[PDB]
A paper describes a structure:
All [name] family members contain a shared core [name] homology domain (MHD) which is a ~ 200 amino acid long domain, which is well conserved across the entire [name] family (individual human MHD’s share more than 40% sequence identity). The MHD domain structure consists of two highly modified winged helix WH domains WH1 and WH2 in a tandem arrangement linked by an extended β-hairpin. The biochemical basis for this activity appears to be exerted through binding to and modulating the activities of RING domain containing E3 ubiquitin ligases. Rather, each [name] protein appears to recognize a unique region on its RING partner, suggesting that [name] proteins are able to function as a versatile and adaptable protein interaction module.
Crystals of the [name]-A3 MHD domain were obtained using a construct spanning residues 104–314, and diffracted to 2.0 Å resolution at Diamond light source beamline I24. The structure was solved by molecular replacement using the experimentally phased structure of [name]-A4 as a search model. The electron density map is of overall excellent quality with the entirety of the single molecule in the asymmetric unit being modelled with the exception of the final 4 residues at the C-terminus, which were not included in the final model due to disorder. The final 15 residues at the C-terminus form an extended peptide, with a short section of 310 helix, which in the [name]-A3 crystals forms an extensive interaction with a neighbouring molecule related by 2-fold crystallographic symmetry. In [name]-A3 the interface area is ~1650 Å2 per monomer, consists of a mixture of polar and non-polar residues, and includes 5 unique hydrogen bonds, 1 salt bridge and two prominent aromatic residues, Tyr 301 and Trp 307, that protrude deep in the groove and make extensive van der Waals interactions with hydrophobic residues. In contrast to MAGEA4, PISA analysis of [name]-A3 identified two potential biologically relevant dimer interfaces. In addition to the peptide interface detailed above (“dimer A”) a second interface is formed almost entirely by interactions from the second WH domain. This interface (“dimer B”) is only slightly less extensive (~1400 Å2 of interface area versus ~1650 Å2) and is formed by the extended β-hairpin connecting the two WH domains, together with the third helix on the second WH domain (α6) and the extended loop regions immediately preceding and following it. Comparing this data to the calculated data obtained using the monomeric [name]-A3, dimer A and dimer B models reveals a significantly better fit for dimer B than either dimer A or monomer, when comparing either in reciprocal or real space (chi2 of 1.99 versus 4.94 or 2.6 respectively). Taken together it is clear that [name]-A3 is predominantly a dimer in solution and that dimer corresponds to dimer B, although it is possible that at higher concentrations these dimeric units may further associate via the C-terminal peptide to form larger open ended oligomers.
Numbering used by the authors:
A (entry chain A), B (entry chain A): 102 to 310
The structure:
Amino acid sequence: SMEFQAALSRKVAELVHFLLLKYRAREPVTKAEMLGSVVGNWQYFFPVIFSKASSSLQLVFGIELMEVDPIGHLYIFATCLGLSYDGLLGDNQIMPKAGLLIIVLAIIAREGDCAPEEKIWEELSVLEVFEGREDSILGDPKKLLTQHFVQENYLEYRQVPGSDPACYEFLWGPRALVETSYVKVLHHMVKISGGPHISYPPLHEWVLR
Amino acid sequence: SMEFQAALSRKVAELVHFLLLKYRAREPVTKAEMLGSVVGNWQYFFPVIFSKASSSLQLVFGIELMEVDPIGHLYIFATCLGLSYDGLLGDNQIMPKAGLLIIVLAIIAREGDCAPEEKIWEELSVLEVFEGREDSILGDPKKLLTQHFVQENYLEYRQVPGSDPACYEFLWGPRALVETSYVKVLHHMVKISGGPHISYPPLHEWVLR
C-alpha cells in the first residue's frame, strides 16, 4: 500500500511532466492523449492521477489547465491569475516560477501592506523545492529567487522606515497591482487548496458532562 | 497525554460555557475574569484554552468575541457576520444557532445559486451536534432545524423546477441577502478555519527520478 501509493505518486509525476512539455510547446492536449501517456493497468486510476496532476500544476507551477472543448476534451494552458510571467528561459529545463511568485504575493497579502523579509524566509524555507541548499556559495536559492520577482517588478524591497540597524521588508510591486489583487490571490490559494479545511472541534471541547 | 489532551479539552468546554453565560446576559467580560474562571495549574495553559474557546464560539455557535478595550482587556460579543439572529428563546438553555445557519448558507454558496436538499442533508449529517438522532419521531432534527432558517427568512425552500417526481432545493432567502453576501460568508469560513490549509504535494509526485 505504501509501496502502492508511492508507485501511484510516480505516475502522477510522469503525467505532470508530460503536461509540462505540452505547456512549454504551447500545444493543446486532449484527455485521450493524457490517458494514452499512462501505461497499462494504471489507466484504471487516471481520474485521481489527472486531478492530482492538475492540482500540482496549479499549486507548484502556477499553471492552469483549462478545457476549451467539453466534447472532444481538448485542454489548453494558462498562467494562474493571468500573470504575464512564468520565469522560463528558452527551452532550458528550469522550473516554471509563477506558482512560487503567487505564494510570495500571498504571504505578503496575509500580513497586510508589507511583510518583514524574515517572514518570507520563514515561510519559504518550508517548501521542499529548495531541497536544503541554503548554504550555496552563490547565495541562498530562495533569496535569489525573490530577486527575480523584484526585478520583474512583481515585488518591491525596501528598508523598514526608521529601522536601526537596517531591517527590510517586501511589498507588492507595480506589476502585481496591475495584473491581480489581494482578494484574487488569497481566493486563489483557497481554491487550489481544495476549499477551506474546517477542523470542527470534538464534542467534549464544547459540551459539558 | 491522550488523558492530558482530554483534560485540556474539558477546560476549553468550561471556558466556552463560562463565556456563553456572559453572552446570554449581554455582560462584557475581561481577560482577567476568564483567567479567573480557570482553576489552578491550568492557568499556565490559558493562551491555548482561550484561543480554542474563542474559535469554538465562532465555528460552533456563530459568536464573535471582540476586544473593545486593548488596555484593560475588556471583551464584548457579537453574532458572526453581524446577523440579527441567534436562535435563542428567553433563558432556556438551548444552543445558539447562528453558527449552524452560516454553515448552511455556506453549503449553498459553494454550490451556486441553489443546492439540492440532499447535499444539505449530506453535509449536515456529518456534524456531531445532531448526535445520531435522525430517527426521532418528531422528525430528523437537522431537517427541523433548517425549517427555523426558512421561517426566519434566511433560507427559501422550493421544488426544483420541472422535477417529476418532485425534488427540492434550498436557496438564500431575502434576509440572508440583506444582512450578508456570498463572498462574505465564504471568506468567513476561511477565516474561522485558520486560513487555507495547503497540503503541498511531496517531491516524488512532481519530480522525476
